[PDB]
Amino acid sequence: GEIITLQAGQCGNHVGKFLWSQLAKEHAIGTDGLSQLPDSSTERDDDTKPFFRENSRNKFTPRAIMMDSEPSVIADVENTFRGFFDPRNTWVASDGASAGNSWANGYDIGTRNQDDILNKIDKEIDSTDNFEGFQLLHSVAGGTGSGLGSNLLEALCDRYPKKILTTYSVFPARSSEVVVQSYNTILALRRLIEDSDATVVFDNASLLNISGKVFRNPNIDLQHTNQLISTIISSVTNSIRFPSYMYSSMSSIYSTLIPSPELHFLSPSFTPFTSAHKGHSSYDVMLDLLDPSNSLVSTAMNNPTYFNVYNTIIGNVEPRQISRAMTKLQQRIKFPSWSSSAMHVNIGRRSPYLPLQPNENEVSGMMLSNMSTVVNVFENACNTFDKVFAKGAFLNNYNVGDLFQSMQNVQDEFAESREVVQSLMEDYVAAEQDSYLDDVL
Amino acid sequence: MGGEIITLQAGQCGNHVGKFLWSQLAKEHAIGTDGLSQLPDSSTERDDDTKPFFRENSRNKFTPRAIMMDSEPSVIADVENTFRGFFDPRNTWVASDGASAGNSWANGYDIGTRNQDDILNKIDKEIDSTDNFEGFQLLHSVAGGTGSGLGSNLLEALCDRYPKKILTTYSVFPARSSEVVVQSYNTILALRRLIEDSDATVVFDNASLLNISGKVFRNPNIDLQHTNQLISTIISSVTNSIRFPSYMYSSMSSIYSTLIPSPELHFLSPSFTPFTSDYIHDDIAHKGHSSYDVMLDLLDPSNSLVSTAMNNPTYFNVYNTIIGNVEPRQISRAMTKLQQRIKFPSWSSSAMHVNIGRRSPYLPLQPNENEVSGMMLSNMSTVVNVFENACNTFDKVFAKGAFLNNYNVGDLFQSMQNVQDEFAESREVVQSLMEDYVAAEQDSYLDDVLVDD
Amino acid sequence: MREVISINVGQAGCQIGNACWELYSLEHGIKPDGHLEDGLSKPKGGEEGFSTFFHETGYGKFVPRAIYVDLEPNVIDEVRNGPYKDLFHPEQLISGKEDAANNYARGHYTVGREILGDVLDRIRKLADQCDGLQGFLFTHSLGGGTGSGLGSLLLEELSAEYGKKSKLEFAVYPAPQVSTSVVEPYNTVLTTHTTLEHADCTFMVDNEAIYDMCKRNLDIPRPSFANLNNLIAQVVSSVTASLRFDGSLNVDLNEFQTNLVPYPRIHFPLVSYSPVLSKSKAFHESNSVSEITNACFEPGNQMVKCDPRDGKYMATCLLYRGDVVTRDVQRAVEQVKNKKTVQLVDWCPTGFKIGICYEPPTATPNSQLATVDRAVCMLSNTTSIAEAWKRIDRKFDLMYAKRAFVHWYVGEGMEEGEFTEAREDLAALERDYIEVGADS
């Protein structure tokens, strides 16, 4: 039942800082880890156990281990959260600052210091008994981050085959470094096809655009996007951090959302929210959740083929608007004839120990969709990689260890990554057809 | 079955650790550095017992039952000046023989043999001042040559002078030696007598000492005095079972009964959590650990005071004493988890043993995060690894015989041939000891009594 | 047994001893006049010194127990002009009425032992005055043949007298290019003979390397003999600081002697000290002791015309003075193990006799080197001295074949067999060092 968070790269460190701050504000833990709730009443309806370890001091240490090749960002996160995280749960490889934005250097750093991370995760798991899986926070664009993520993914698949492993990965925006960044992505994406049990997708361009829309200043800071990701992660975990009757396990959410292990890449959406009036009813909330300008990923599709959709509405809601919006969405969203037109809604309770977010009494909603829009960004990334690879052989200059000893194996690994992502997108586009399940009908 | 124990300070390290241990005991029993109990003598009810280690001449004064033995009078005078009236001046032995003429074990053995009458007279006089006596606790300081020779001399005297007393020993080994040959030779010559006569021996490798002093202390530079403080706190924690007697272990013989499986295997491996009575002990309330975590740390190699060399190590007698407000359910959980996480020899179904101690009513109470501490002692064969490299040194230097012009003086043999033969015999003895330890790591060891009856 | 007796032989030896006593009094805050000044002042008493070298009188005066022996009356007048003669007792200084020869042919002859009898009864009386002795100290030079001869003869006599205490002989070695006296090769060979007679430990030092250091490191245009004597005072003070002051790693002199000699015969270890830099450069640099160790391993800080990088590594001792951190010395030995430049012998390899002195180093104001709070002294055994001895032996054999001065020698009272045996002893020592380097 307990879940461990993995913050890879500076992006991972930032989003972990933001998410742990958000959760400490929600569960009333604060930046000092001490219980902000009085000791007179012990009755609680939340569950800080899977995310926080409570000691004899009644201090909640975040169940997270930070892995990065850059010690400065981790030291800064520690400074802003002095007395919150455990110094023993910090891993910087003891190799100094980061160097090289290729997946080779990151994966080699992971392979070299794999023993320390294994000891750390074993100690963290042995602290309790009821463990369920890990949470990985990394950017596929970051070379060291993607290398560390792939290394830990391999370690956790060949070490814990019974623990479901989900990850959060943000694809970069339309920029210049993608010519190498995409490289790392597809390599990580390769492992994402092999060992990743679940994955939530993000596109940095759409994230920046939506932030500039919701934020007044168009000069969107990366910390603001990190705050957005912390909000979406706290929202998807609301059913876990605040279970009442129905949803008390991420396994159930991945059951109702992931139909098959080959399709475990979900696109999120969250609306409306601040980062002060209510003007979006639950019906409006859901029709906005359907709107492309509220999804955390670039849609770039006229009518995406939804396979399995599931949402959680936060706020006090009446089932009448729920049913009206469900009927309207069934009239709007198309499902394949071979799959089910399943739509599920979870009523997420609000935390009484959380400071009131701006726009009070404004009902909000999060939705996770499995459609052919994730494969559109995947095709964009794979096309960029194919162009920059078949057109220019420059990747044979930035490699480490086994990848630097010979570049032909690097070319073969990149070609195999291209082949496996091609097979994945082909399986996706075939699932869009009714003839996908023709072998039984 | 409880008797009094006398401390034996041999060498400079021996005297320093004795000073630190007696200061720690004065801190625990409120005796201070003046020898007069800081508590008024009107309160007769005392949960502890200073009698096994403190002789009481006046009601408020408790003289530590210990003898100070060294060849360098400077450290003895320093300890006596710092501890004004605490120690007994008549129990300070220097022999007025001057400074040691080198770090040779032969020099210390000779200075102990020549002045054997005086030290034996002092020991007999101290035995006369007591009635119920059980044994001694000898501090070797085998890193020094004169100290190791003196310790070997005292051992060779007390083995046959008092065969009915259990003689425990404490050997401190250095991490790195400037001249590994001389220190290796001294340690081998002392270990010969340890195997022959010593009943119990606790090793202290300075590598883990330096590592821990760098980890838990704030200062990067490591001073020898607060490093000896670690060993002194260790000795106080182990003697707590008699000074603050529990309800399971109340005698050193009973403690060694579960720790000595046979007179051959008499070398133990220590481990201790982050201490609390040391100098820099303020960074202990941020740990937020439980008794199960304390047991894990006791089983962790980072808390072992000797070179671990943990390559599937075989345990023979795992025991622990836990001081503080201990819970039985946490103890049961820790035992369950450790029995699933500790390698045991298949020929013996005996598992690890857990003991619980009591905290002193006058010691500074610590916060609820490190209020409870614990000490662990495990019989492991990896201790011979600490000697292995040492023997390696022997095995790579004994082919030539360097530094032979220094072990020829003092001892009974001035010739090179006799010293060479004695060194070869000591090497054979330590080789046979390592063979016994590696045979105990197998099930055929116990099967030897099954194949023949 | 803690006391140490020092001997000053020859002109250069007397000057070196003067500089050494000057630096000694300067470190303990004592004026060169006496009474006091001042103390016996925290901790100039116990731990000794100043009572090991500075015998304390009944009134508190600290007289340095030194014997200045030289057959040159000029040097005696010079050492009398200084205030240390007033500090010394008139019986401590031994005046030379007439110089034996130029400079060794008669110094080591019967004319030497005529005054050696007097100096030996004086040494016996002094030992009766001050009991206890840790080691015999000697200061002389190979350039002044009288100094070398008298020092070698007195060393042999005292080793035959006691033989239980160590012998530390400081000998100044001439540069292989300049020969102020053409008699010096013969003298050096015959002195190597006397060292083969008795040598507990001998320190080799070349004035050429020291003058080069003063020109380069001390930025001195023309290095003076006074600066060389001051540097020798500094190095010997750093050596004796282990016994003078308190330290976490205090090493006995006999311990040094036995550590330097693991083999059946080792007599000649080379020395090196650091830092030796300019005053302004000392103000410009604030390096740790690790860089000081790295610089001391270089041939520049050796103060001798020998390259330790060329010769093979043997058992060495690293002394440190001032503020020392264990992490610093651990990083230093790590970097040394990472160097892997010199070849290590099979017995020693991980051998570095570490000594620590809490007292900060102190330098004289006349010296261009600013006083430092940290100093590292490396004393190691090397086979480059064998090469220097081989060059000197080539020159001496050429002169012996030319037999020009052998006539004057046999007129002085020398024999062909004596020089033949001295040459054989020198060749034997060279071959011995060659073999113990080859055994690595």
Ligand SMILES: Nc1nc2c(ncn2[C@@H]2O[C@H](COP(=O)(O)OP(=O)(O)OP(=O)(O)O)[C@@H](O)[C@H]2O)c(=O)[nH]1
């Ligand atoms: N939204 C968001 N993305 C970030 C942030 N920081 C890093 N990233 C992602 O990381 C990518 C850049 O790579 P880096 O973060 O430098 O990772 P790296 O290349 O391995 O370099 P190091 O992290 O220093 O090891 C960008 O494309 C971003 O998508 C952040 O603060 N917010």
Ligand SMILES: Nc1nc2c(ncn2[C@@H]2O[C@H](COP(=O)(O)OP(=O)(O)OP(=O)(O)O)[C@@H](O)[C@H]2O)c(=O)[nH]1
């Ligand atoms: N860790 C530690 N080791 C010490 C201490 N004192 C001495 N030693 C050890 O002892 C060795 C030096 O020998 P000494 O203890 O001085 O014995 P000694 O040389 O005969 O000198 P004396 O005992 O005074 O006669 C060193 O290698 C140390 O390992 C100390 O205070 N702390």
